[PDB]
């Protein structure tokens, strides 16, 4: 006999009820995957439901209201500036670079 397939096939490989650490580990991973296929199966069904079956479906009380109410409180929140600390040095750089090359350019642009 040897230890290749005799007494070396029980290392936490006999049953899930033989250890609450392996039973919960496999139960926590199975539930996590379900959340990904769920939030992805619910959002996908809702998007396609607003194209062929615009009628009721599950949650359609404030569809455009959520689109307007969300952009109404955000778009109406201090808009007298192109934002500064809300972006980055590169985003702010795009602003200065976007105006720098857009100053004196009457014939010399980016032609090939």
């Amino acid at each position: 006999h040897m230890l290749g397939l005799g007494a070396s096939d029980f290392e936490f490989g006999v049953d899930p009820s033989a250890d609450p650490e392996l039973a919960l580990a496999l139960r926590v991973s199975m539930e996590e995957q379900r959340q990904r296929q769920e939030e992805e199966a619910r959002r996908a069904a809702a998007a396609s439901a607003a194209e062929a079956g615009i009628a009721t479906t599950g949650t359609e009380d404030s569809d455009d209201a959520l689109l307007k109410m969300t952009i109404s409180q955000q778009e109406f929140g201090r808009t007298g500036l192109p934002d500064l600390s809300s972006m980055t040095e590169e985003e702010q750089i795009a602003y200065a670079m976007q105006m720098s090359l857009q100053g004196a350019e009457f014939g010399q642009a980016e032609s090939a």
Binding site: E89, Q92, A96, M97
Partner: protein, 76 residues
């Protein structure tokens, strides 16, 4: 020579610099004029960012040139 720098607030400042001056020296000049840290000052010209190791002449910047100033957020 003298040059102008426009900030995100459309404010333009006039400074006295030479073509052999480095960009880092230009940022220090803006700080002494306003009070902003040179580490957060960025100079942009013709769509090209100026490098602290490069001089104004390297970017063909001549007197009365208009440079753009940007804020850099990377210092804690």
């Amino acid at each position: 020579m003298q040059i102008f720098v426009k900030t995100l607030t459309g404010k333009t400042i006039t400074l006295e610099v030479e073509p052999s001056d480095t960009i880092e020296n230009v940022k220090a000049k803006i700080q002494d004029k306003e009070g902003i840290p040179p580490d957060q000052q960025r100079l942009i010209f013709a769509g090209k960012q100026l490098e602290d190791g490069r001089t104004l002449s390297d970017y063909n910047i001549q007197k009365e040139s208009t440079l753009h100033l940007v804020l850099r957020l990377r210092g804690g």
